[PDB]
Design an enzyme around this catalytic site. Sequence first.
Site, PDB file in Angstrom:
ATOM      1  N   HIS A  84       0.029   0.595  -5.957  1.00  8.92           N
ATOM      2  CA  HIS A  84      -1.210  -0.214  -6.255  1.00  8.92           C
ATOM      3  C   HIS A  84      -1.091  -1.089  -7.499  1.00  8.92           C
ATOM      4  CE1 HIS A  84      -2.961   2.849  -3.460  1.00  8.92           C
ATOM      5  NE2 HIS A  84      -3.563   1.758  -3.015  1.00  8.92           N
ATOM      6  N   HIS A  88       1.129  -5.319  -4.310  1.00  5.24           N
ATOM      7  CA  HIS A  88       0.307  -4.913  -3.175  1.00  5.24           C
ATOM      8  C   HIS A  88      -0.783  -5.931  -2.859  1.00  5.24           C
ATOM      9  CE1 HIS A  88      -2.401  -2.637  -0.587  1.00  5.24           C
ATOM     10  NE2 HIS A  88      -3.307  -2.593  -1.555  1.00  5.24           N
ATOM     11  N   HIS A 124      -8.993  -6.649  -4.906  1.00  2.00           N
ATOM     12  CA  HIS A 124      -9.565  -5.539  -4.200  1.00  2.00           C
ATOM     13  C   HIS A 124      -9.111  -4.172  -4.729  1.00  2.00           C
ATOM     14  CE1 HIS A 124      -5.852  -5.004  -1.848  1.00  2.00           C
ATOM     15  NE2 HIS A 124      -6.361  -3.813  -1.569  1.00  2.00           N
ATOM     16  N   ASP A 125      -8.046  -4.187  -5.543  1.00  5.88           N
ATOM     17  CA  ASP A 125      -7.557  -2.969  -6.261  1.00  5.88           C
ATOM     18  C   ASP A 125      -7.462  -3.058  -7.783  1.00  5.88           C
ATOM     19  OD1 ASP A 125      -7.286  -0.937  -4.213  1.00  5.88           O
ATOM     20  OD2 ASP A 125      -5.435  -1.913  -3.537  1.00  5.88           O
ATOM     21  N   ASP A 237      -5.071  -4.130   4.193  1.00  5.09           N
ATOM     22  CA  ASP A 237      -4.787  -2.920   3.396  1.00  5.09           C
ATOM     23  C   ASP A 237      -3.940  -1.855   4.114  1.00  5.09           C
ATOM     24  OD1 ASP A 237      -5.275  -2.098   0.744  1.00  5.09           O
ATOM     25  OD2 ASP A 237      -7.129  -1.005   1.258  1.00  5.09           O
TER      26      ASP A 237
HETATM   27  C1  LIG Z   1      -1.790  13.729   7.859  1.00  6.94           C
HETATM   28  C2  LIG Z   1      -2.002  13.101   9.246  1.00  6.94           C
HETATM   29  C3  LIG Z   1      -1.308  13.955  10.316  1.00  6.94           C
HETATM   30  C4  LIG Z   1      -3.502  13.005   9.545  1.00  6.94           C
HETATM   31  C5  LIG Z   1      -4.242  11.999   8.705  1.00  6.94           C
HETATM   32  O1  LIG Z   1      -5.425  12.132   8.470  1.00  6.94           O
HETATM   33  N1  LIG Z   1      -3.496  10.935   8.137  1.00  6.94           N
HETATM   34  C6  LIG Z   1      -4.228   9.963   7.298  1.00  6.94           C
HETATM   35  C7  LIG Z   1      -4.184  10.354   5.824  1.00  6.94           C
HETATM   36  O2  LIG Z   1      -3.456  11.297   5.458  1.00  6.94           O
HETATM   37  N2  LIG Z   1      -4.914   9.602   4.968  1.00  6.94           N
HETATM   38  C8  LIG Z   1      -5.731   8.421   5.333  1.00  6.94           C
HETATM   39  C9  LIG Z   1      -5.235   7.177   4.613  1.00  6.94           C
HETATM   40  C10 LIG Z   1      -5.135   7.402   3.108  1.00  6.94           C
HETATM   41  N3  LIG Z   1      -4.538   6.260   2.386  1.00  6.94           N
HETATM   42  N4  LIG Z   1      -3.224   5.985   2.744  1.00  6.94           N
HETATM   43  C11 LIG Z   1      -2.742   4.829   2.456  1.00  6.94           C
HETATM   44  C12 LIG Z   1      -1.367   4.525   2.933  1.00  6.94           C
HETATM   45  C13 LIG Z   1      -0.774   3.274   2.826  1.00  6.94           C
HETATM   46  C14 LIG Z   1       0.497   3.056   3.339  1.00  6.94           C
HETATM   47  C15 LIG Z   1       1.185   4.086   3.969  1.00  6.94           C
HETATM   48  O3  LIG Z   1       2.447   4.050   4.490  1.00  6.94           O
HETATM   49  C16 LIG Z   1       3.051   2.904   4.829  1.00  6.94           C
HETATM   50  F1  LIG Z   1       2.186   2.172   5.595  1.00  6.94           F
HETATM   51  F2  LIG Z   1       3.299   2.178   3.700  1.00  6.94           F
HETATM   52  C17 LIG Z   1       0.594   5.360   4.086  1.00  6.94           C
HETATM   53  O4  LIG Z   1       1.337   6.287   4.783  1.00  6.94           O
HETATM   54  C18 LIG Z   1       1.639   7.564   4.451  1.00  6.94           C
HETATM   55  F3  LIG Z   1       0.654   8.126   3.772  1.00  6.94           F
HETATM   56  F4  LIG Z   1       1.676   8.281   5.589  1.00  6.94           F
HETATM   57  C19 LIG Z   1      -0.700   5.546   3.627  1.00  6.94           C
HETATM   58  C20 LIG Z   1      -3.563   3.756   1.756  1.00  6.94           C
HETATM   59  C21 LIG Z   1      -4.372   2.997   2.823  1.00  6.94           C
HETATM   60  C22 LIG Z   1      -5.581   2.317   2.273  1.00  6.94           C
HETATM   61  C23 LIG Z   1      -6.010   2.481   1.023  1.00  6.94           C
HETATM   62  C24 LIG Z   1      -5.326   3.376   0.029  1.00  6.94           C
HETATM   63  C25 LIG Z   1      -4.475   4.448   0.712  1.00  6.94           C
HETATM   64  C26 LIG Z   1      -5.231   5.547   1.411  1.00  6.94           C
HETATM   65  O5  LIG Z   1      -6.417   5.777   1.195  1.00  6.94           O
HETATM   66  C27 LIG Z   1      -4.354   8.675   2.767  1.00  6.94           C
HETATM   67  C28 LIG Z   1      -4.919   9.866   3.517  1.00  6.94           C
HETATM   68  C29 LIG Z   1      -2.094  10.809   8.217  1.00  6.94           C
HETATM   69  O6  LIG Z   1      -1.454  10.142   7.417  1.00  6.94           O
HETATM   70  C30 LIG Z   1      -1.446  11.674   9.256  1.00  6.94           C
HETATM   71 MG   LIG Z   2      -8.109   0.312  -2.735  1.00  8.42          MG
HETATM   72 ZN   LIG Z   3      -5.312  -1.899  -1.367  1.00  8.02          ZN
END
Ligand SMILES: CC1(C)CC(=O)N(CC(=O)N2CCC(N3N=C(c4ccc(OC(F)F)c(OC(F)F)c4)[C@H]4CC=CC[C@H]4C3=O)CC2)C(=O)C1
Ligand SMILES: [Mg+2]
Ligand SMILES: [Zn+2]
Length: 333
Positions: A84, A88, A124-125, A237
């Site tokens: 972040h 990004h 936004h961040d 995002d």
């Molecule tokens: C654990 C599971 C089996 C079940 C499940 O519920 N989820 C979702 C989860 O765990 N979440 C929801 C998203 C959250 N989150 N996650 C971000 C993020 C960005 C890029 C990523 O990797 C690649 F794209 F670069 C990434 O991937 C990696 F985490 F897997 C996650 C951001 C998105 C928006 C705003 C801020 C960041 C935010 O709030 C985190 C919690 C699962 O992941 C599968």
């Molecule tokens: Mg944010």
């Molecule tokens: Zn963001």
Amino acid sequence: VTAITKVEREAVLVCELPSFDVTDVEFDLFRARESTDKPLDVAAAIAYRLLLGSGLPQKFGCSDEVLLNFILQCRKKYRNVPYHNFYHVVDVCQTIHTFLYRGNVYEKLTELECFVLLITALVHDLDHMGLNNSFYLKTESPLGILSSASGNTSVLEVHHCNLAVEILSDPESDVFDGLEGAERTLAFRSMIDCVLATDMAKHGSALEAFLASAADQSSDEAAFHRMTMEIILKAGDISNVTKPFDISRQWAMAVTEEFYRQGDMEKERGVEVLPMFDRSKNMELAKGQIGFIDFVAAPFFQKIVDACLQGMQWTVDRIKSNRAQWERVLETR
Ligand SMILES: CC1(C)CC(=O)N(CC(=O)N2CCC(N3N=C(c4ccc(OC(F)F)c(OC(F)F)c4)[C@H]4CC=CC[C@H]4C3=O)CC2)C(=O)C1
Ligand SMILES: [Mg+2]
Ligand SMILES: [Zn+2]
């Protein structure tokens, strides 16, 4: 806010970005950052070029200098964290530009709305410290206490909006200074609505509202526009999985390290560490990416494309190709 200097502007203006097409869906920001020893300037120049190339700032009375000033005021409030950071938000800005113009989502929005979305990407961040909202609540940090006392659990998102309004309160960095009345109100409200909608705790409700609006030919028009903006900023995002594999992987590495640094701090403070934030769980990158794809990104992009945003089909296609590629990492391990 301290005024941006001539010298700060010039340092962005000298960057020519030879060999990059900032409008392309395969544009590689990591390659851009590796291309010079001033990656912060190159990133600012990418954002500046995207915004001028849209033709939008000119239309709304925003001069080249005020645009650049705004960009640099945003840049000064990003921190040196693994994910972040300024890159990004520039990535989100560039990605949104592709959804609007390669994906033809511009057709659903006014020019002002397109301009707001591009600008909103950069705010936004603001001042993210690499810790999510949950961290602040769990640790009863002062910002967490404030959020709970004031009734809004989107701890960071309200903070980002605060800093965006501060930047825009000086005419020298106000990209909306050429607006008045209803249009200026719409620009600020839409920017703030969009930022507030980036809280992933509201992901399902945001998506469901958009889909119900897109399916209703009698939806209120202004509401549909606003939801489309919210969904586009959300799309940007969570767009890392929509990029060529090697780009996608580099984002994933950066987010994982940020998350692990959070988990390390949570361990020191004796608060709950989720598995995805725990270095000691040693979670494989492939499995985490496949899981994010299956449970978040694939259904999001498929649903919005099918509902209304048919020109963004490539995102679904690339997510499917990335998922297959992670599956090949598992198959050959
Ligand atoms: C654990 C599971 C089996 C079940 C499940 O519920 N989820 C979702 C989860 O765990 N979440 C929801 C998203 C959250 N989150 N996650 C971000 C993020 C960005 C890029 C990523 O990797 C690649 F794209 F670069 C990434 O991937 C990696 F985490 F897997 C996650 C951001 C998105 C928006 C705003 C801020 C960041 C935010 O709030 C985190 C919690 C699962 O992941 C599968
Ligand atoms: Mg944010
Ligand atoms: Zn963001």
